[PDB]
Amino acid sequence: PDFTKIIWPTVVERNFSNPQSEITTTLQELYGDTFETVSICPPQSYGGELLKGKIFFSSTPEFTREDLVEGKILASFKLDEVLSGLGMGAMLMTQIMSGHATIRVSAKVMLSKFCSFALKLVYDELMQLNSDTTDFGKISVLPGAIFSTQEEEFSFDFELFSPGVHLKFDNNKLLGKVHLAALSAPNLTENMPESFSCTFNFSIVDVKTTFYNIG
């Protein structure tokens, strides 16, 4: 043993070794040490993991004939409202305070066999389009797809993005904004209905809860 002892740099110092602890003045059954692991458990009878694959939100807004110019926003949905509504699907979702959620959205317009127009269903992720936008420069480039509103019912999935590893839901007014945009005037415009009805169904494709709300 001399100065040529190789030194392995460790952070564990031997100034505190095995801390033994022994019961002295009473019985063990009266004095117990518990070793637990505080992990997050979603509840048993509810929690977003029941909505996995199922619908949790549904609206039916309307839009007029005069709003069917190119680019006009017809219907809008803030994801922070769709996830915090008054239905049973939402109230099970506002209990998740942080986690992951991939959400399916579907649109469906009821039309005659006469009229038929095309609509884009866009996911404005940074909420850069208020509902009073007739741009079409922004509509044409946003992520989404076009579909015909007479013979079809169009749906797609999108993942909620978080800068961190999970996504804090509590007090998060920046979860995205879904829009239905008009690309063109209707097929026929004379002697036609002056308003339409579109159904929106938001579903849960996947949910993970990394922290659950407790009172």
Binding site: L30, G32, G164, F211
Partner: protein, 166 residues
């Protein structure tokens, strides 16, 4: 990023009093080693230049009471820096939390897995451990029970960043 499998820190939190009574009581212990006091702890002496770290915490908790004192104890983690004033016992039993009677189990070790939305702990992001007595504490005529915790070590430590030495 530097990685440390086992990193002992032996930081003890402030011991918190609880008077006996029927009112529901909560003792909050934040686990923020970046928090400075009079002396720099073992965590700060080696990893205070970091911007944020990651790793599982091990905490020794201790409840000192009399031998004729009854209470139910819920040890509850709180991540992502949320503030809970009141707990819903329905919600705790739905999440399968188990309470312990301090007249039978008043010493323990809590493993806290790494859970943070941002991706790491920091000066502002840290876990909390809440000792929640739903029925208060029933003790002998003016007793105060004391709840004391010690951050024992950090398992699977990882840290990044380089702050300015102020």
């Amino acid at each position: 990023c530097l990685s440390i499998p086992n990193f002992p820190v032996h930081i003890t939190g402030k011991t918190q009093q609880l008077h006996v009574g029927p009112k529901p009581s909560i003792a909050r212990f934040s686990f923020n080693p970046f928090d400075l006091g009079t002396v720099f702890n073992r965590f700060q002496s080696l990893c205070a230049h970091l911007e944020g770290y990651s790793g599982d915490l091990i905490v020794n908790w201790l409840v000192t009471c009399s031998a004729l004192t009854n209470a139910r104890l819920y040890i509850i983690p709180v991540y992502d820096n949320y503030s809970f004033e009141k707990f819903s016992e329905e919600k705790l039993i739905q999440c399968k939390y188990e309470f312990k009677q301090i007249s039978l189990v008043r010493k323990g070790t809590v493993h806290i897995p790494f859970v943070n939305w941002f991706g790491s702990y920091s000066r502002t992001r840290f876990p909390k451990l809440l000792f929640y007595f739903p029925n208060g504490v029933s003790g002998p005529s003016g007793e105060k029970i004391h709840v004391t915790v010690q951050l024992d070590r950090i398992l699977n430590f990882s840290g990044l960043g380089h702050r300015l030495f102020k």
